[PDB]
Enzyme design. Structure first.
Site, short mmCIF file in Angstrom:
data_model
loop_
_atom_site.label_atom_id
_atom_site.label_comp_id
_atom_site.label_asym_id
_atom_site.label_seq_id
_atom_site.Cartn_x
_atom_site.Cartn_y
_atom_site.Cartn_z
N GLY A 142 2.67 1.61 8.68
CA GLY A 142 2.09 1.07 8.47
C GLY A 142 0.39 1.96 7.40
N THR A 143 -0.36 0.96 7.52
CA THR A 143 -1.31 1.95 6.20
C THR A 143 -2.31 2.71 7.15
OG1 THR A 143 -3.74 -0.24 6.66
CG2 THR A 143 -1.65 -0.64 5.60
N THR A 144 -2.92 3.34 6.00
CA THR A 144 -3.76 4.97 7.43
C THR A 144 -5.13 4.08 7.81
OG1 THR A 144 -2.96 6.52 5.55
CG2 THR A 144 -4.49 7.19 6.89
N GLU A 197 -7.77 2.36 5.16
CA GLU A 197 -7.39 1.48 4.33
C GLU A 197 -6.72 0.45 4.34
OE1 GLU A 197 -3.86 3.68 2.18
OE2 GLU A 197 -3.28 3.62 3.32
N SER A 211 -3.00 1.03 12.94
CA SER A 211 -2.38 1.04 11.98
C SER A 211 -0.29 1.10 12.70
CB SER A 211 -1.39 2.77 11.55
OG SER A 211 -2.69 2.74 11.06
#
Ligand SMILES: [Cl-]
Ligand SMILES: [Mg+2]
Lengths: 235, 244, 231, 243, 195, 240, 241, 111, 250
Positions: D29-31, D46, D74
Site C-alpha cells: 500500500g501507499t505510505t 500519500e 496503509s
C-alpha cells in the site's frame, strides 16, 4: 473441495456455468411471440413406451395471463412455478390487477442466485415465461439459473437449441400470425427431435389476451401436425 | 474455512453405498458375537464378551445384554458407549408410549424408532453413524415373541434366529442347519450356546465370557419374565448342555 | 493457485484472488461511461444483446430522484446493490427528510462489498458500478469496484475496451467539465467518449442507453428513439 | 506443508502465515505516517494520483473516530474502513456507558482485540491494513500503530506502507534532534516533508498530500484536517526540502 | 354444544348427542352430529365452546387414523381415551385451552367388552357404566342409578335412553332439538335413524 | 447447523449424489407395478439370501399410505420409511383440511417434492429410493400408477418396474403389455405381474410378493399359496 | 497431514498445534522470572525496546488483572492482551457472583480450562502464550501459578519462562537447595526484587540498566508495577554490595 | 396509564365528478379545547394523480400518508415506472391499514 | 467468528477403526502409570506425582480428585482433559442426580454420566476425544465397593484390580498374582505400593506418590455434628506421612 459460490478465473460462477450444461441435456422447448399471441411448445421425450405421455407436464400455467415452459432438471422447476404462482396471486391480492410479465419473471429470477453455504445449489432448469399485459403486450422471457432474463421475439432452449435458434433467426418476422407461429414451433421441434414428432411426444400451448393461457388438446395438435405435413409437401 | 476438514459422513459412493455405514459394519464384524433365537414358548439371547481378563468383575459387568423395559431386551454388537446412548433413548420412548396410551409399547414400534434415529445420522447432520448393531428380543400381545435386528444404516428386519458381530456367516449357517419352527426355549438355549462354542475365536467357551438372557411366557400365571443370567447360572447351563 | 479457493484466503504476496476474479467479470462486461460538469452528471452505456432475436440487457438503474448507477458485470449483483442503495436513499428521506449525499452512498457500497471479502461462505460481488448524482454539493460521479474501493471522479469508464473511453476523457477533462447548463452537449461528449471503446459494432437506436441527472433535472433514463438524436 | 492455507493455523515455527501474508498487502500500500508532538498528534498520508480524472481533495483517506481520534491506514482501503466503523461503534458504546470520550489507550485495545480476533478462526481473514491512529485525551497526546496480528504499541513517530523505511529513518532523526519535543505546527511541516521524501519509493505516479491533526492548543483537542493556507505552507516547506 | 349422554350395556356402548346448534338468539341448525368416528370400533362425542369442539374432535380423529395406518392396527378404547386425556391435560395449561368435554364409546375387540370413558376439558378421565357432560347429568344420573343393570341388552339400553331424553325434554329450559343416537359394538358403529 | 452443499453440479452438468442415489435404487430388490382395466397390482422381489426370517413381523415391501393408496419401493429400506411416514402424515392432513382423501397424483407429487427438496438443501443427501405409488382416486374407478425417483421427477405408467434387473422386466412388459387392451381382470393382471417377476426372481414363490389394489379402498395382499398357484400355472403353460 | 493443522490427535497421540503454540511463546525473545518472599511475590521480566520510535512506557508484558492479582506473559502481545482482557473480565465477574476477590490459583485454573477448550475444540486455536499469575493470596499467602497453551497449570515456589528458562530455573533450584525453604526469607519486597534481579543477572550473565527490566510486585491487598526510577534504586543497591 | 391515541379534530370531504375529483379538508389542528395550528395541511398530493387524507389522530394520519407515498415510490421501482391506478392504490391502502388491525391507525382515510 | 465445525472429526476408516479414539488411547499409553485395587472393605487408587519441575509445588497438582464424598477418580494421559472432566463429573452428580433424588449417585451411574460425556466427544461436531483413561473408585449403599475404568471411546468396565498408562501391562500381571477376594484394605494399599514401585524410576516416597482410598465413613472429616444419618465421606486422600509409614513395612 471448493466453495459453491466460487468465481472462476474468467469471472463466472462455476456452479451457474455447470447448471447451464444440465439445461443443454434437457428436452427441447420453443417459444414464439407474435402480435396475436405467444406460442409455447415442448418435446415430451418419454423414456419408455409404457410411460403415459400425457402425465409429462413440461408446460405449466402461472396465472390466466402467464404461461411457462421448462427444460433441464424439471423437478427443480416445481418450487419456481410455486413461487411464480404465489407471486402472481399475491400481487393481485395487494393491487387488484394482473401482474406484469416482466415483474413476474424478475420475481422468479430473484430465487436463482439464492444459493450458498438458502438452497445448496443453483436450479438446473431454464424457463420460457410467456404472457400478456396491458402495458407491454405479448411477451416471451428466458429465465436462467444465473438470475438473468432476456426478452425474446422467439427462443429455443434445451438439447436442440442452437440448431433451433438459427432456424428461428430466419423464420421470425414481426407480422407472424398465431396459426403461422404454431406451425413454426411444430416445424422446428420436428427438426431437432430424435423421435418422429406426433401429438403424444410433443405438446403445444399459447397465451392470448381474450382466452388467456391454454394447453392444446392432443386432437388439436394432431390437426396442426397434419396441416404442417401438407404445407411442406406443397413445395 | 472449515470445509477443508469435513469427511462428509452422509454421502453416496459411486456404487450407491454409504461409506460410513459400510465401515461401521466392518467395525461391528470384529465385535463379540451375539445370537438371538426365538422359540414358540420364549426367546433366548446369548452373547460373547470380548475382553477376557481374570480381574474383570463379571457379576456387576454389562457390555452385551441390556434391558429396555419389562418386555423388551437387546443384545449389543459394536461400540458399547454408542449403544448406551441409543439404549437410553429407547428406554425413554417406551415410557413415553406407556404414559400416552397406558399400554406397553409394541416391540416393532420401539425398534422402528431406534432404527429411524440411526437412519437420520446417515442422511443428515454430518456426524458419524452409530457403530452398533442390536438384536431386539421382545414380547407383546399382538405378535407375541419377536426377534429383530437393526444396524448402522437404520434398516431393521425380523428373525426366527439371527446373529450379529463376529463370524455371523458361520453362525447363521449353523443356526439355519439346526433350527426348527416347533422348537422350545430349552432347546434354543442349547442351540445358542453350541453355535457360540463353534464360532468363537477363543480356545474354549466358559462362563466368565458369556452374557445370557431369556424372555419366557413361563412366569407364574401367564405373565412374561426377563431373566438376565448371573455368572453362576451361566456356569450351570454350560454344564447342563455339556459344553464344559 | 492454492490460495484462490475462497475469499477468506490471502496469497503469499498479499492478494485476494477471489476478489481479483470478481474484478475480471467486470472486464468481460459491456462498456459503460460516466462523466460530469458542475451542473449535470451523465451516464452512457453500451447495452449487450444475446443474439438478434433477444433484447439488449439494461445497464442503467435508478436509485432515487437525484441518484442512479450504470452496471458492468453480473447484472443480478447490480440489482442487489442498487436495491440496497434504493433503501439507503429511502431511509435517509423517511427518517431525516434528507437526500442521501452521493459521497455517503459510495461509503455504504464500499462497506457492503467489504463484508463479503472477509467472511467465509460468501463471495465478492461480481459487478462494477458507475454512480452519478446531484446533491447539496453539486454534481458527482463515483466508480465502485467489488473489492470495496470507491472513487470520486470527473469522468471514467468500466467494462470491455474501457481504456479507450478513459483516455479520451483524460484529454477532454478541461472541456467537458465546463459544459454547464447544457445537457445535450454533455451527453454528446459522453457518446463521443464511449465511441472510443467500440470495435466492429456501432451505436444503434436499441444499442445505446443514456441517463442524466442535474440541477433542475431528475435522474431520467433515455432508451430507444429518445437516444436517436445523439447517434 | 499446508500451514499457510488456513488462518489461525500455527506453523511448526509458531507462526500464523496468513497474518504474515496480510502484512504483504500492507507493505504493498501507499505510505502513511504519524507524528507525536508536544500537545497532540499529526497524521499524514500519500495518495497516488492514478489518473488526471481523480477529483483533487475528494477521495479522503484519513478518518475521524468520535471527535478527538484520527485514523490513517496503509493496505486494503476497505479493510481499514471496516476497522474504523468498528472503532466508531466501540467509541460510541464507551461514551454511552461511561460519559467521557474514549481514552486513546482504551481505544487502541478495542481495535487491538478486534483485529486479534480475526487471527483466531479459519472462517475469517486477517485485516490487510496497518493502522496509525491517536489523539488527545485527559492524560495528553497518544500515537499508536496497529498491525494485522492485533499487535500495537505506543509511538513517538510511526510509519507504514511502501515508503516505511524511508519515513522511519526521517522520524528517527526528529526524535534525536528534538528530545524536549516538537510543536504541532512543526509536526505538520515535518509530516509533509516525510511523505514527500517517502514518495521516492512510489516515484512513478505523482501524488496528493493529505494531513490531519489533533492538538490541545491548535485544535482544542479535536481532530481536524489541515486545509488551505496551512496545507499549502506545509507543501511549500516540503517542496523546498527535497530541492 | 349442550347435551351428550353415554351408556355402556352388556355388549355395546350407546352415545346420544343433541342436534341443536344455537348461536345466542337463534337456533342455526337442528340436525348437527356432535360426534366423530376415531376408529372402526371407537366413537367420540363432544360438547363445549364453539369452534374448539370440532377442531379438537377432528384433530384427535386425524391422529388416531394416522396411528391406524402406521401400525395397521386399531388402538384399544383405553389407549385412545388415554391419548385424548393427555391432549386435554396438556391443553389446560396452554395459552388458550381447548374448552371441550368428550365421551369416548368403544368396543374392545381383544377383551370383547364395551367401554365408556368420560373426559372433561381439564383432562379428568373416568371409566363409567353411564356418563354425561354439563347439566345433562343433573337430570339423567338419578334415572340411570335407578334403572341401569350391567347385563342390559342394546334394546333395553335404548329404552332407558328414551326415558333420559324424555326427562331432559320435560325439565331442561333449552330446546336441544332431540338427539342423534349411535351404537358401538363388535360389528362397528351404526346410527339409529328413528329416535 | 450442518449446512454443507453435498448435492452439487459437476463440470458436465450432473449432480453425482443424485445419480449415485439411483445406483442405490439399482441395488435394491426389484419392484413392479401393472395396472389392469379395473385394478392395479404391485409385485415385489424378496431376496432369498435371508432365510430364518420371520415374515409375520419383517417390514413388508408394499406400504399403505391411506386406505386407497399404496407405496412400494426399490433402494435403501431405512430411507423409504421416512418417505412413507411423511406421505401418511400428508394423507391425513389432506383429509383434515380438504375433507377428501388425496388423489394418487397428489400424493405422488408430494413424495416427489420431498425427494427433490433433498437434492438442493444443505447438509442432506438425496433419498436412495425410487417409489411406485398406486391406487384409485376417491369415487373414481380409473386405475392409477405413478413412479418417483431421487431427483424428484415423477410420471404416470401403464406398467413399470424399478430396482435390480428392472431393465429385463421392463423389456418383458414392453412386449407383453398392450395399451389398447390391458389385463381385463384381476387374475390376468396378477398373472402378468408374476410372469414379469419370474424373468428375474429365479426361485419359486417365497421370493415373490403380490398386492392387489381395487377401487373403493379394496386392498389385499396375496398369500404364499395363492401366488404359488400362479407360479405353477405359468410354468405348466411354458412347457410347450 | 491435516492432523498438524487443527487440534486433533496425530498417530503418536500428539497435538501438533499445541506444541507449535508453545514455540510461539518464545517469539518475543524475552525471559521472565517469579519468586516469593515472606510477605510478597515478585515478578521480573526483560524489557526490549529495539525501535527508537516506540514509546517505551507503552511496551509491557506485565498486566494488572485485579488489585491483588498480577500477570506476566511470555508470548506475542496480541495473544497476551487477549488473555489479559479475559482474565480481568473473569476476575471481576467472580467478585460480583461470589462476593470475594478471585484467588490467583482459581484464576489460573479458569484460564487453563479455557486453554484446554482450544486444544479440544477445532475452530478455536490455542493462544501462543504462557501466563504467570502472581499474588499474595489471603488464604494461601504468596502465590505463583502458571498456565500454558496445553491447558496445564501448577503452583510454583519460584519459576522462570522464556528462551533461557532452563538457565534461570537451575540457578533458582540451586539457591533453594542451599536455603532449604520454599521462599526468599526477607522482610521487605525491595530486597526480594533485588534478589530476583541479582539471580537473573547471574543466570543470564548480562548486566541491566533501568530501561532493560520490568518489575511487578504483589503485596497483601495490592499488585503494582515499578517505574524506571524505582528499578534504578534497586539497581544502585545491588551494585553497592 | 399511557393512552397512545389522541384526537386532532378536523374534517375532510371527497367528491367525484364526471372527469375530475376533489378532496377538501379544513386546515385547523386541535387538541382538547386548544388550537395547535390554524394552517396545518391535511390533504396531500401523493404522486400519480392521487390525493390522500387521513383524518383523525394526526400522528397516525401522517404515518399512513408517509407510508403510502413510499409505497408509490417503491411501486415505480419494482414495476418499471408504471402508474399506480386509483383502484390499485385503494387496495394497497387496505393492506397498510389492516396490517395494523390489532393496533389501528385511528383515522378516516379518503383518496 | 463462526463455529463451522458441525461435522464429526472422528470417523470410521475402511478397516472399521475409529482413528481418533485409537490415537487418544496412544496418548493414554504415554501417560504416567495409575492403578486401582478393590478390597473387601475398601478400594484404593494410586498414581505417581510426576513433577515437571522441582520448583513446582506438586501438592497443588491433584491427580487424585474427590468427585463425591464416596467416589474418587484418578487418570492416565492428558492432565488438562482430566481436570475439565472432574469439573463436569462433579457438576453432573448434582444436576442429573442430587438435585432430583436428594442423595449422591451410585458409583456405576456417575461413571455412566462421565462415559456419556466422553462418548459425545467421540461423535459430536468439531471436537476430538478426551485423551485420558479414568479409574473411578467408589462406594454406595446397595452396590457396595466398586472400581471402574473409563476409556476415550466412552466404554467402561468394572475391575477387581487394574492399571492404566505407561507400565500397565507389567502392572496388571503383578496384580493378577497378588489379588484375591479376601483382601483387607491395608493389604490392598500394600499391594498398590509394591505395584507402583516397579513403574517409578526416581524418588519413591509420600511426596512423589498420590494415593487415596474409598473406605470407612470418616465422621471426623464431616465438619459438623448433629445428624446421625450423615456419617461422613468414605473418600480419603492419604497424607505424605501416612504413605511413608507404610513404606517402612514394605
Ligand atoms: Cl472453568
Ligand atoms: Mg483448536
Amino acid at each position: 473441495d471448493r466453495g459453491v459460490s466460487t468465481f472462476s478465473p474468467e469471472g463466472r460462477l462455476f456452479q451457474v456455468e455447470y447448471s447451464l450444461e444440465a439445461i443443454k441435456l434437457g428436452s427441447t422447448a420453443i417459444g414464439i411471440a407474435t402480435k396475436e399471441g405467444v406460442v409455447l411448445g415442448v418435446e415430451k421425450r418419454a423414456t419408455s413406451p409404457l410411460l403415459e405421455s400425457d402425465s409429462i407436464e413440461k408446460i405449466v400455467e402461472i396465472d390466466r395471463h402467464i404461461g411457462c415452459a421448462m427444460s433441464g432438471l424439471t423437478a427443480d422447476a416445481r418450487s419456481m412455478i410455486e413461487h411464480a404462482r404465489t407471486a402472481a396471486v399475491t400481487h393481485n391480492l395487494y393491487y387488484d390487477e394482473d401482474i406484469n410479465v416482466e415483474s413476474l419473471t424478475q420475481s422468479v429470477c430473484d430465487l436463482a442466485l439464492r444459493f450458498g453455504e438458502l438452497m445448496s445449489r443453483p436450479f438446473g432448469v431454464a424457463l420460457l415465461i410467456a404472457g400478456h399485459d396491458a402495458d407491454d403486450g405479448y411477451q416471451l422471457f428466458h429465465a436462467e439459473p444465473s438470475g438473468t432474463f432476456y426478452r425474446y421475439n422467439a427462443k429455443a432452449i434445451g438439447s436442440g437449441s442452437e440448431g433451433a435458434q438459427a432456424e428461428l433467426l430466419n423464420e421470425w418476422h414481426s407480422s407472424l400470425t398465431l396459426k403461422e407461429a404454431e406451425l413454426l414451433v411444430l416445424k422446428i421441434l420436428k427438426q431437432v427431435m430424435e423421435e418422429k414428432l406426433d401429438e403424444n411426444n410433443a405438446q403445444l400451448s399459447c397465451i392470448t389476451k381474450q382466452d388467456g393461457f391454454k394447453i392444446y388438446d392432443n386432437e388439436k395438435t394432431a390437426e396442426l401436425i397434419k396441416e404442417l405435413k401438407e404445407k411442406e409437401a406443397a413445395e | 474455512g472449515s470445509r477443508r476438514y469435513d469427511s462428509r459422513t452422509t454421502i453416496f459412493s459411486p456404487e450407491g453405498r454409504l461409506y460410513q455405514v459400510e465401515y461401521a459394519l466392518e467395525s461391528i464384524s470384529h465385535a463379540g458375537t451375539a445370537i438371538g433365537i426365538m422359540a414358540s414358548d420364549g426367546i433366548v439371547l446369548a452373547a460373547e464378551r470380548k475382553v477376557t481378563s481374570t480381574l474383570l468383575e463379571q457379576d456387576t459387568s454389562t457390555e452385551k445384554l441390556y434391558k429396555l423395559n419389562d418386555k423388551i431386551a437387546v443384545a449389543v454388537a459394536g461400540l458399547t458407549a454408542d449403544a448406551e446412548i441409543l439404549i437410553n433413548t429407547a428406554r425413554i420412548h417406551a415410557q413415553n408410549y406407556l404414559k400416552t396410551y397406558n399400554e406397553d409399547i409394541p416391540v416393532e414400534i420401539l425398534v422402528r424408532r431406534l432404527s429411524d434415529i440411526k437412519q437420520g445420522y446417515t442422511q443428515h447432520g454430518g456426524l458419524r453413524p452409530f457403530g452398533v448393531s442390536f438384536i431386539y428380543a421382545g414380547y407383546d400381545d399382538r405378535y407375541g415373541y419377536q426377534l429383530y435386528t437393526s444396524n448402522p444404516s437404520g434398516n431393521y428386519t425380523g428373525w426366527k434366529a439371527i446373529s450379529v458381530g463376529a463370524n455371523t456367516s458361520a453362525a447363521q449357517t449353523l443356526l439355519q442347519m439346526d433350527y426348527k419352527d416347533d422348537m422350545k426355549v430349552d432347546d434354543a438355549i442349547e442351540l445358542a450356546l453350541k453355535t457360540l462354542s463353534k464360532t468363537t475365536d477363543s480356545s474354549a467357551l466358559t462362563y466368565d465370557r458369556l452374557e445370557f438372557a431369556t424372555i419366557r411366557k413361563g412366569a407364574n400365571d401367564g405373565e412374561v419374565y426377563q431373566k438376565i443370567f448371573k455368572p453362576q447360572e451361566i456356569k450351570d447351563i454350560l454344564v447342563k448342555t455339556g459344553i464344559t | 493457485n492454492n490460495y484462490d479457493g475462497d475469499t477468506v484466503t490471502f496469497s503469499p504476496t498479499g492478494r485476494l484472488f477471489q476478489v481479483e476474479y470478481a474484478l475480471e467479470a467486470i472486464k468481460q462486461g459491456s462498456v459503460t461511461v460516466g462523466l460530469r460538469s458542475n451542473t449535470h452528471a451523465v451516464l452512457v452505456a453500451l447495452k449487450r444483446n444475446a443474439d438478434e432475436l433477444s433484447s439488449y440487457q439494461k445497464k442503467i438503474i435508478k436509485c432515487d430522484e437525484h441518484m442512479g448507477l450504470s452496471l458492468a458485470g453480473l447484472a443480478p449483483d447490480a440489482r442487489v446493490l442498487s436495491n440496497y442503495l434504493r433503501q439507503q436513499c429511502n431511509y435517509s428521506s423517511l427518517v431525516f427528510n434528507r437526500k442521501l449525499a452521493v459521497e455517503r452512498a459510495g461509503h455504504l457500497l464500499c462497506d457492503k462489498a467489504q463484508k463479503n471479502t472477509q467472511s467465509y461462505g460468501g463471495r465478492p460481488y461480481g459487478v462494477g458500478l458507475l454512480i452519478i448524482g446531484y446533491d447539496k454539493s453539486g454534481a458527482h460521479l463515483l466508480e465502485f469496484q467489488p473489492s470495496g474501493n470507491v472513487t470520486e471522479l470527473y469522468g471514467t469508464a468500466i467494462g470491455a475496451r474501457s481504456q479507450g473511453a478513459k483516455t479520451y476523457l483524460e484529454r477532454t477533462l478541461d472541456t467537458f467539465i465546463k459544459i454547464d447548463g447544457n445537457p445535450d452537449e454533455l451527453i454528446k461528449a459522453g457518446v463521443e467518449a464511449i465511441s472510443q471503446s467500440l470495435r466492429d459494432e456501432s451505436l444503434t437506436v436499441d444499442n445505446l442507453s443514456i441517463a442524466i441527472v442535474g440541477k433542475d433535472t431528475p435522474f431520467t433514463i433515455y432508451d430507444g428513439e429518445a437516444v436517436a438524436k445523439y447517434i | 506443508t499446508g500451514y499457510d492455507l488456513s488462518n489461525s493455523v500455527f506453523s511448526p515455527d509458531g507462526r500464523n502465515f496468513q497474518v504474515e501474508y496480510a502484512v504483504k498487502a500492507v507493505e504493498n500500500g501507499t505510505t502513511s505516517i504519524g507524528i507525536k508532538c508536544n500537545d497532540g498528534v499529526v497524521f499524514a498520508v500519500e495518495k497516488l494520483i492514478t489518473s488526471k480524472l481523480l477529483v483533487p481533495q475528494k477521495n479522503v483517506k484519513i478518518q475521524v473516530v468520535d471527535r478527538h481520534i484520527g485514523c490513517v491506514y496503509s493496505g486494503l482501503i476497505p479493510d481499514g474502513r471496516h476497522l474504523v466503523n468498528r472503532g466508531r461503534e466501540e467509541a460510541a458504546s464507551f461514551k454511552k456507558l461511561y460519559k467521557t470520550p474514549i481514552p486513546i489507550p482504551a481505544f487502541a485495545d478495542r481495535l487491538g482485540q478486534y483485529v486479534q480476533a480475526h487471527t483466531l478462526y479459519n472462517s475469517v481473514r486477517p485485516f490487510g491494513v496497518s493502522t496509525i491512529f491517536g489523539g488527545v485525551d485527559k492524560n495528553g497526546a497518544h500515537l499508536y500503530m496497529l498491525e494485522p496480528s492485533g499487535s500495537y504499541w505506543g509511538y513517538k513517530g510511526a510509519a507504514t506502507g511502501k515508503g516505511r523505511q524511508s519515513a522511519k529513518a526521517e522520524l528517527e532523526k526528529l526524535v534525536d534532534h528534538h528530545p524536549e519535543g516538537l510543536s504541532a505546527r512543526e509536526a505538520v511541516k515535518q509530516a509533509a516533508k516525510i511523505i514527500y521524501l517517502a514518495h521516492e519509493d512510489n516515484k512513478e505516479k505523482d501524488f496528493e498530500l493529505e494531513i490531519s491533526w489533533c492538538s490541545l492548543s491548535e485544535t482544542n483537542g479535536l481532530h481536524k484536517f489541515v486545509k488551505g493556507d496551512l496545507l499549502q505552507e506545509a507543501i511549500d516547506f516540503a517542496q523546498k526540502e527535497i530541492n | 354444544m349442550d347435551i351428550i349422554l353415554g351408556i355402556r350395556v352388556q355388549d355395546s356402548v350407546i352415545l346420544a348427542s343433541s342436534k341443536a346448534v344455537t348461536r345466542g338468539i337463534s337456533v342455526l341448525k337442528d340436525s348437527d352430529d356432535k360426534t366423530r368416528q376415531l376408529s372402526p370400533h371407537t366413537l367420540m362425542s363432544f360438547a363445549g365452546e364453539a369452534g374448539d369442539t370440532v377442531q379438537f374432535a377432528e384433530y384427535i380423529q386425524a391422529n388416531i387414523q394416522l396411528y391406524s395406518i402406521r401400525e395397521d392396527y386399531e388402538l384399544s378404547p383405553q389407549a385412545v381415551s388415554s391419548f385424548v386425556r393427555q391432549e386435554l391435560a396438556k391443553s389446560i395449561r396452554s395459552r388458550r385451552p381447548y374448552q371441550v368435554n368428550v365421551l369416548i364409546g368403544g368396543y374392545d375387540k381383544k377383551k370383547n367388552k364395551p367401554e365408556l370413558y368420560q373426559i372433561d376439558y381439564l383432562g379428568t378421565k373416568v371409566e363409567l357404566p353411564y356418563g354425561a357432560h354439563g347439566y345433562s347429568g343433573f337430570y339423567t344420573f338419578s334415572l340411570l342409578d335407578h334403572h341401569y343393570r350391567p347385563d342390559m341388552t342394546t334394546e333395553e339400553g335404548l329404552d332407558l335412553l328414551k326415558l333420559c331424553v324424555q326427562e331432559l325434554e320435560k325439565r331442561m329450559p333449552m330446546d336441544f332439538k332431540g338427539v342423534i343416537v349411535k351404537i358401538v359394538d363388535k360389528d362397528g358403529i351404526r346410527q339409529v335413524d328413528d329416535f | 447447523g450442518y449446512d454443507r452443499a453435498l448435492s452439487i453440479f459437476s463440470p458436465d452438468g450432473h449432480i453425482f449424489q443424485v445419480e449415485y442415489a439411483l445406483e442405490a435404487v439399482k441395488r435394491g430388490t426389484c419392484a413392479v407395478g401393472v395396472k389392469g382395466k379395473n385394478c392395479v397390482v404391485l409385485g415385489c422381489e424378496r431376496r432369498s439370501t435371508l432365510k430364518l426370517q420371520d415374515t409375520r413381523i419383517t417390514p413388508s415391501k408394499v406400504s399403505k399410505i391411506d386406505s386407497h393408496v399404496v407405496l412400494s419401493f426399490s433402494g435403501l429400506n431405512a430411507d423409504s420409511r421416512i418417505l412413507i411416514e411423511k406421505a401418511r402424515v400428508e394423507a391425513q392432513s389432506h383429509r383434515l383440511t380438504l375433507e377428501d382423501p388425496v388423489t394418487v397424483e397428489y400424493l405422488t407429487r408430494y413424495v416427489a417434492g420431498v425427494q427433490q427438496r433433498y437434492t438442493q438443501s444443505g447438509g442432506v443427501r438425496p433419498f436412495g429410493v425410487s417409489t411406485l405409488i398406486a391406487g384409485f382416486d376417491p369415487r373414481d374407478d380409473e386405475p392409477k400408477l405413478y413412479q418417483t425417483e431421487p431427483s424428484g421427477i415423477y410420471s404416470s405408467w401403464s406398467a413399470q418396474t424399478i430396482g435390480r434387473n428392472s431393465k429385463t422386466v421392463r423389456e418383458f412388459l414392453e412386449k407383453n403389455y398392450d395399451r389398447k387392451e390391458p389385463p381385463a381382470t384381476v387374475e390376468e393382471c396378477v398373472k402378468l405381474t408374476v410372469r414379469s417377476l419370474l424373468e428375474v426372481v429365479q426361485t419359486g414363490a417365497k421370493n415373490i410378493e403380490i398386492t392387489v389394489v381395487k377401487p373403493d379402498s379394496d386392498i389385499v395382499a396375496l398369500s404364499s399359496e395363492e401366488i404359488n398357484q400362479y407360479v405353477t400355472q405359468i410354468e405348466q403353460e411354458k412347457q410347450e | 497431514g491435516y492432523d498438524r493443522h487443527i487440534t486433533i490427535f496425530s498417530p503418536e497421540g500428539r497435538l501438533y498445534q499445541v506444541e507449535y503454540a508453545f514455540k510461539a511463546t518464545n517469539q518475543t525473545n524475552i525471559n521472565s522470572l517469579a519468586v516469593r518472599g515472606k510477605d510478597c511475590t515478585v515478578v521480573i521480566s526483560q524489557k526490549k525496546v529495539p525501535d527508537k520510535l516506540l514509546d517505551p512506557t507503552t511496551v509491557s508484558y506485565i498486566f494488572c488483572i485485579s488489585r491483588t492479582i498480577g500477570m506476566v506473559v511470555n508470548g506475542p502481545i496480541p495473544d497476551a492482551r487477549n488473555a489479559a482482557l479475559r482474565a480481568k473480565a473473569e476476575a471481576a465477574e467472580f467478585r460480583y457472583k461470589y462476593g470475594y476477590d478471585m484467588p490467583c490459583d482459581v484464576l489460573a485454573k479458569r484460564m487453563a480450562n479455557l486453554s484446554q477448550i482450544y486444544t479440544q475444540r477445532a475452530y478455536m486455536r490455542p493462544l501462543g502464550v504462557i501466563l504467570t499469575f502472581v499474588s499474595v493470596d489471603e488464604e494461601l499467602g504468596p502465590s505463583i501459578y502458571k498456565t500454558d497453551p496445553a491447558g496445564y497449570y501448577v503452583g510454583y515456589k519460584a519459576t522462570a519462562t522464556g528462551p533461557k528458562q532452563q538457565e534461570i530455573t537451575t540457578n533458582l533450584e540451586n539457591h533453594f537447595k542451599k536455603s532449604k525453604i520454599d521462599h526468599i526469607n526477607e522482610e521487605s519486597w525491595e530486597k526480594v526484587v533485588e534478589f530476583a534481579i541479582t539471580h537473573m543477572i547471574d543466570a543470564l550473565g548480562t548486566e541491566f540498566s533501568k530501561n532493560d527490566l520490568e518489575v511487578g510486585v504483589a503485596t497483601k491487598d495490592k499488585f503494582f508495577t515499578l517505574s524506571a526510577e524505582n528499578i534504578e534504586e534497586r539497581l544502585v543497591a545491588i551494585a553497592e554490595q | 396509564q399511557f393512552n397512545p391515541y389522541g384526537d386532532n379534530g378536523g374534517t375532510i370531504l371527497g367528491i367525484a365528478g364526471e372527469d375530475f375529483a376533489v378532496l377538501a379538508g379544513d386546515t385547523r389542528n386541535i387538541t382538547d379545547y386548544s388550537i395547535n395550528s390554524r394552517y396545518e395541511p391535511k390533504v396531500f398530493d401523493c404522486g400519480d394523480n392521487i390525493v390522500m387524507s387521513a383524518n383523525g389522530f394526526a400522528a397516525d394520519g401522517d404515518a399512513l400518508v408517509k407510508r403510502f407515498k413510499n409505497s408509490v415510490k417503491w411501486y415505480h421501482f419494482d414495476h418499471n415506472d408504471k402508474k399506480l391506478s386509483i383502484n390499485s392504490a385503494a387496495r394497497n391502502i387496505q393492506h397498510l391499514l389492516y396490517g395494523k388491525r390489532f393496533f389501528p391507525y385511528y383515522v378516516h382515510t379518503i383518496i | 467468528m463462526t463455529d463451522r465445525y458441525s461435522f464429526s472429526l472422528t470417523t470410521f476408516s475402511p478397516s472399521g477403526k475409529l482413528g481418533q479414539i485409537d490415537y487418544a488411547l496412544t496418548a493414554v499409553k504415554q501417560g504416567v502409570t495409575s492403578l486401582g485395587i478393590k478390597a473387601t472393605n475398601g478400594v484404593v487408587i494410586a498414581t505417581e506425582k510426576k513433577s515437571s519441575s522441582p520448583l513446582a509445588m506438586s501438592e497443588t497438582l491433584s491427580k487424585v480428585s474427590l468427585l463425591t464424598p464416596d467416589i474418587g477418580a484418578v487418570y492416565s494421559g492428558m492432565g488438562p482433559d482430566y481436570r475439565v472432566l472432574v469439573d463436569k463429573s462433579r457438576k453432573v452428580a448434582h444436576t442429573s442426580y442430587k438435585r432430583i433424588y436428594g442423595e449422591y449417585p451410585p458409583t456405576k451411574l456417575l461413571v455412566s454420566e462421565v462415559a456419556k460425556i466422553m462418548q459425545e466427544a467421540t461423535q459430536s461436531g468439531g471436537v476430538r476425544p478426551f485423551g485420558v483413561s479414568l479409574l473411578i473408585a467408589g462406594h454406595d449403599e446397595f452396590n457396595g465397593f466398586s472400581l471402574y475404568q473409563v476409556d476415550p471411546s466412552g466404554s467402561y468396565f468394572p475391575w477387581k484390580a487394574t492399571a492404566i498408562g505407561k507400565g500397565s501391562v507389567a502392572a496388571k500381571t503383578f496384580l493378577e498374582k497378588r489379588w484375591n477376594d479376601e483382601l483387607e484394605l491395608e493389604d490392598a494399599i500394600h499391594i498398590a505400593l509394591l505395584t507402583l514401585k516397579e513403574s517409578v524410576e526416581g524418588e519413591f516416597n509420600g511426596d512423589t506418590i498420590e494415593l487415596a482410598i474409598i473406605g470407612d465413613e470418616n465422621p471426623d472429616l464431616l465438619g459438623y455434628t448433629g445428624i446421625p444419618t450423615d456419617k461422613g465421606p468414605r473418600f480419603r486422600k492419604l497424607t505424605s506421612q501416612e504413605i511413608n509409614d507404610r513404606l517402612e513395612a514394605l
